[PDB]
Design an enzyme around this catalytic site. Structure first.
Site, PDB file in Angstrom:
ATOM      1  N   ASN A  11       0.156 -15.483   9.116  1.00 60.70           N
ATOM      2  CA  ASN A  11       1.042 -14.356   9.417  1.00 60.70           C
ATOM      3  C   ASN A  11       0.858 -13.837  10.839  1.00 60.70           C
ATOM      4  O   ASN A  11       1.765 -13.189  11.387  1.00 60.70           O
ATOM      5  CB  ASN A  11       0.792 -13.208   8.437  1.00 60.70           C
ATOM      6  CG  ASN A  11       1.244 -13.510   7.044  1.00 60.70           C
ATOM      7  OD1 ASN A  11       1.950 -14.493   6.772  1.00 60.70           O
ATOM      8  ND2 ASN A  11       0.856 -12.642   6.134  1.00 60.70           N
ATOM      9  N   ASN A  70      -3.666  -9.201   0.951  1.00 60.10           N
ATOM     10  CA  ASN A  70      -5.063  -9.153   0.532  1.00 60.10           C
ATOM     11  C   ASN A  70      -5.716 -10.519   0.604  1.00 60.10           C
ATOM     12  O   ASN A  70      -6.922 -10.621   0.363  1.00 60.10           O
ATOM     13  CB  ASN A  70      -5.196  -8.633  -0.901  1.00 60.10           C
ATOM     14  CG  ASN A  70      -4.832  -7.164  -1.039  1.00 60.10           C
ATOM     15  OD1 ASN A  70      -5.545  -6.272  -0.540  1.00 60.10           O
ATOM     16  ND2 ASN A  70      -3.739  -6.893  -1.758  1.00 60.10           N
ATOM     17  N   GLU A 118       4.956  -7.133  -7.905  1.00 57.18           N
ATOM     18  CA  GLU A 118       3.783  -6.633  -8.620  1.00 57.18           C
ATOM     19  C   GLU A 118       4.024  -5.272  -9.265  1.00 57.18           C
ATOM     20  O   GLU A 118       3.330  -4.913 -10.230  1.00 57.18           O
ATOM     21  CB  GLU A 118       2.598  -6.556  -7.670  1.00 57.18           C
ATOM     22  CG  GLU A 118       2.760  -5.590  -6.511  1.00 57.18           C
ATOM     23  CD  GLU A 118       1.762  -5.890  -5.396  1.00 57.18           C
ATOM     24  OE1 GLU A 118       0.695  -5.222  -5.360  1.00 57.18           O
ATOM     25  OE2 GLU A 118       2.047  -6.809  -4.586  1.00 57.18           O
ATOM     26  N   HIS A 174       7.219   9.875   7.791  1.00 53.52           N
ATOM     27  CA  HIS A 174       7.335   8.738   6.868  1.00 53.52           C
ATOM     28  C   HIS A 174       8.740   8.623   6.280  1.00 53.52           C
ATOM     29  O   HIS A 174       9.257   7.510   6.129  1.00 53.52           O
ATOM     30  CB  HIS A 174       6.305   8.861   5.756  1.00 53.52           C
ATOM     31  CG  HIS A 174       6.018   7.580   5.018  1.00 53.52           C
ATOM     32  ND1 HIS A 174       4.828   7.380   4.364  1.00 53.52           N
ATOM     33  CD2 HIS A 174       6.748   6.450   4.823  1.00 53.52           C
ATOM     34  CE1 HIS A 174       4.832   6.191   3.784  1.00 53.52           C
ATOM     35  NE2 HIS A 174       5.994   5.614   4.023  1.00 53.52           N
ATOM     36  N   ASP A 180      -1.194  -0.690  10.123  1.00 57.00           N
ATOM     37  CA  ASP A 180      -0.126   0.213   9.715  1.00 57.00           C
ATOM     38  C   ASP A 180      -0.576   0.931   8.448  1.00 57.00           C
ATOM     39  O   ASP A 180      -0.504   0.380   7.344  1.00 57.00           O
ATOM     40  CB  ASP A 180       1.183  -0.534   9.508  1.00 57.00           C
ATOM     41  CG  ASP A 180       2.325   0.410   9.260  1.00 57.00           C
ATOM     42  OD1 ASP A 180       2.888   0.927  10.248  1.00 57.00           O
ATOM     43  OD2 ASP A 180       2.612   0.668   8.077  1.00 57.00           O
ATOM     44  N   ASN A 215      12.510   5.371   8.134  1.00 50.04           N
ATOM     45  CA  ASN A 215      13.488   5.519   7.053  1.00 50.04           C
ATOM     46  C   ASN A 215      14.578   6.536   7.386  1.00 50.04           C
ATOM     47  O   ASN A 215      15.196   7.102   6.474  1.00 50.04           O
ATOM     48  CB  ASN A 215      12.806   5.908   5.733  1.00 50.04           C
ATOM     49  CG  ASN A 215      11.855   4.839   5.237  1.00 50.04           C
ATOM     50  OD1 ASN A 215      12.280   3.711   5.003  1.00 50.04           O
ATOM     51  ND2 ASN A 215      10.568   5.176   5.075  1.00 50.04           N
ATOM     52  N   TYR A 234      -0.867   6.109   1.350  1.00 54.11           N
ATOM     53  CA  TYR A 234      -1.394   4.849   0.828  1.00 54.11           C
ATOM     54  C   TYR A 234      -2.733   4.995   0.130  1.00 54.11           C
ATOM     55  O   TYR A 234      -3.077   4.129  -0.690  1.00 54.11           O
ATOM     56  CB  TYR A 234      -1.540   3.815   1.941  1.00 54.11           C
ATOM     57  CG  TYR A 234      -0.242   3.379   2.579  1.00 54.11           C
ATOM     58  CD1 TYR A 234       0.987   3.691   2.012  1.00 54.11           C
ATOM     59  CD2 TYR A 234      -0.250   2.679   3.778  1.00 54.11           C
ATOM     60  CE1 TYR A 234       2.187   3.300   2.623  1.00 54.11           C
ATOM     61  CE2 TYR A 234       0.916   2.287   4.379  1.00 54.11           C
ATOM     62  CZ  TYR A 234       2.133   2.600   3.815  1.00 54.11           C
ATOM     63  OH  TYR A 234       3.284   2.221   4.459  1.00 54.11           O
ATOM     64  N   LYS A 276       1.296   7.898   9.052  1.00 54.80           N
ATOM     65  CA  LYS A 276       2.598   8.473   8.725  1.00 54.80           C
ATOM     66  C   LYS A 276       2.399   9.786   7.983  1.00 54.80           C
ATOM     67  O   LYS A 276       1.632   9.838   7.006  1.00 54.80           O
ATOM     68  CB  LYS A 276       3.432   7.525   7.854  1.00 54.80           C
ATOM     69  CG  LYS A 276       3.454   6.083   8.341  1.00 54.80           C
ATOM     70  CD  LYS A 276       4.418   5.222   7.532  1.00 54.80           C
ATOM     71  CE  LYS A 276       4.285   3.746   7.900  1.00 54.80           C
ATOM     72  NZ  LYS A 276       3.073   3.060   7.391  1.00 54.80           N
TER      73      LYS A 276
END
Ligand SMILES: NC(=O)C1=CN([C@@H]2O[C@H](COP(=O)(O)OP(=O)(O)OC[C@H]3O[C@@H](n4cnc5c(N)ncnc54)[C@H](OP(=O)(O)O)[C@@H]3O)[C@@H](O)[C@H]2O)C=C[C@H]1SC[C@H](O)[C@@H](O)CS
Ligand SMILES: NC(=O)C1=CN([C@@H]2O[C@H](COP(=O)(O)OP(=O)(O)OC[C@H]3O[C@@H](n4cnc5c(N)ncnc54)[C@H](OP(=O)(O)O)[C@@H]3O)[C@@H](O)[C@H]2O)C=C[C@H]1SC[C@H](O)[C@@H](O)CS
Lengths: 329, 329
Positions: A288, A280, A231, A118, A51, A174, A56, A85
């Site tokens: 996962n 990461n 973060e 997006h 994805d 969204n 990004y 996106k």
């Protein structure tokens, strides 16, 4: 490939006719320096969906990791499902094809499997060579500027992209249900996928019900709720009780010898909502991926349902303090 | 007209240049047999704005009451502000002018002051002579059927109505902020007014903020929350603590020698949100008109703010159980 239990191979058949893996790898905030290695090792571990997004800023590195696995023959291209996106800067129809060509050029791919709008937000266009990714930059310092391009105009441009096959399927992200309801009035090709923030603190059940009733697949993001945002020092996420330690979640995890994170992911995928957990860390990568080999009970869904509080972490309202972006108001 | 206190004469200047009274008379469920007399006496008492709709089925009676007061010279036409609303059956652009002409014919008026898109919902057209008002009828028993007419197409037709002056201003009702954000991308004429359900149980503050920041006026409906719906045996309204007896409201009413109902209305109008309280009772008629001569405090707004629970009584989700209408999901 012969054990009759649920696994990371399960998929959703999209209304475009293509299969989309139920579990994929999310690429937001996957660090540029190591992104190619991370993507390559995720493919090795068994991830097939990635994805990505123009926003990004790691599209080239993602492509390097993909093309390494393809060059080594670890996987064939048609086994991979690559999502990207269209960023807010590129909603003008004349810029939509340009944007897809940019993605393909950066990722060194012939086609992508899924191209999403997006956000239902149209920023003033910024040329690639001026700033890429442009993020919140709109040609004027910190000031936001916008384009008067109705969503349906952008969508018609996305529709044309499917004809040449460079985007096999198209979709949205969204968008509220009200926006989707209007968009389908003008659409020749229904969106294949809606991607939305989705976790036990933000369950939007009527949105899920309406959209799935239309044959549109749903992909959840931020399945771990506030975690992705710590973060970034997101103040609301910093103040939110972690889902990983929430008693409703941990008591369900205790029943199945699964981690809370695995319960949070399976809660989505068992309802045919695709997931794209990000890491990461090569050690949670596998945990996962292996979430579909157990089932929550009906009582578990009832209990998790009680956690809904309409708590939204990724809200464009907070971006522009001069012109509030009201897409979730 | 010379006492320097707030009164029922106060108005909002619309972005079309016309003034709209802050306090008007709501016409939903005003009984046909007595509606003309009620409207005439409301004009006598001092009401100048009347909130009608094609759906309400009392348009002719409203017109009879208006035209009685005009014939007696109690008021001039330009002192009255008449609102009507385009029903869901008439969103196809070719039917929008037809619908306005129907309103004017029924009400025996040359123009209306404000024509609203009643809902962001497009039903299959039903001819006037087949059923009027058509309500939920879509040509096929109890089954709903819909038209693929994007809202912007309907809006462009509403825009053309302002040119001939038969609708002085135009607007929208029951649109979410996300829909308004997209509509303005295609609009030549911004809506003058948004009319929405609005009361202390459903405060939608970010919707209010975004819309007012656009220079769009807001009209509240169902300012008494569940009360309007009790006669219809609305199960949720039947189970909802009345706002009239809620301690936050009654304690504020106790400070100003006002009724709870007067606090609930002024809570809106003091924020420049117009109100349209409805009553078949000629005794509460006057109390509902005289709400602007006192002011709530900043602490009162803080306290009333706590009542918000996103409790929506008028939700089209409940209309069509086969195809859920998701405009508020
Ligand atoms: N469509 C959109 O607008 C967006 C889509 N995405 C996409 O979803 C992917 C995943 O969502 P994330 O927000 O990346 O966060 P999530 O997976 O919920 O959690 C990641 C954090 O959790 C830790 N982690 C991972 N695995 C764990 C396990 N098993 N146990 C505990 N903790 C775990 C991670 O830590 P490590 O990396 O150290 O493991 C993370 O801290 C996204 O990747 C993306 O593909 C998401 C958001 C938005 S785009 C964002 C925004 O809209 C911008 O584009 C504009 S401002
Ligand atoms: N745009 C829309 O979709 C709609 C707009 N309207 C418009 O708003 C007007 C007022 O809202 P109402 O829902 O009619 O109810 P409200 O004024 O909140 O309360 C009326 C009840 O309260 C009692 N009452 C009046 N004054 C009182 C005082 N001072 N003290 C106590 N109680 C009081 C009344 O009782 P009496 O008549 O016996 O006095 C009432 O019981 C509407 O009139 C309309 O103009 C509202 C809703 C919707 S349209 C509805 C729906 O969408 C349909 O069209 C499709 S299904």
């Amino acid at each position: 490939g012969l054990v009759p239990r649920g696994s990371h191979m399960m998929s959703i058949k999209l209304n475009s006719g293509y299969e989309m893996p139920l579990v994929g790898f999310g690429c937001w905030k996957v660090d540029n320096a190591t992104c190619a290695d991370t993507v390559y090792n995720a493919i090795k571990v068994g991830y097939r969906l990635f994805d990505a997004a123009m926003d990004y800023g790691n599209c080239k590195e993602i492509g390097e990791g993909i093309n390494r696995a393809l060059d080594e023959g670890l996987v064939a291209r048609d086994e991979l499902f690559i999502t990207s996106k269209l960023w807010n800067s590129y909603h003008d129809p004349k810029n939509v094809e340009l944007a897809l060509k940019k993605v393909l050029s950066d990722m060194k791919l012939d086609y992508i499997d899924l191209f999403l709008i997006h956000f239902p937000i149209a920023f003033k266009f910024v040329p690639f060579e001026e700033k890429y990714p442009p993020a919140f930059y709109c040609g004027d310092g910190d000031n936001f500027h916008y384009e008067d391009v109705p969503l349906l105009e952008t969508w018609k441009a996305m529709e044309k992209l499917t004809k040449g096959g460079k985007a096999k399927s198209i979709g949205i992200s969204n968008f509220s249900a009200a926006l989707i309801y209007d968009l389908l009035r003008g659409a020749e090709i229904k969106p294949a996928v809606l991607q939305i923030e989705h976790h036990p603190y933000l369950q939007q059940p009527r949105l899920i019900e309406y959209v799935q009733s239309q044959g549109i697949a749903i992909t959840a993001y931020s399945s771990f709720g506030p975690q992705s945002f710590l973060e970034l020092k997101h103040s609301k996420a910093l103040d939110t009780p972690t889902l990983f330690e929430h008693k409703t979640i941990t008591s369900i995890a205790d029943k199945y010898k699964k981690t809370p994170a695995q319960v949070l992911l399976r809660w989505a995928s068992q309802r045919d909502i695709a997931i794209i957990p990000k890491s990461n860390n090569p050690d949670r990568l596998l945990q996962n991926l292996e979430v579909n080999d157990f089932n929550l009970s009906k009582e578990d869904f009832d209990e998790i349902s009680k956690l809904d509080q309409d708590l939204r972490f990724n809200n464009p309202w907070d971006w522009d303090t001069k012109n509030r972006i009201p897409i979730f108001a």
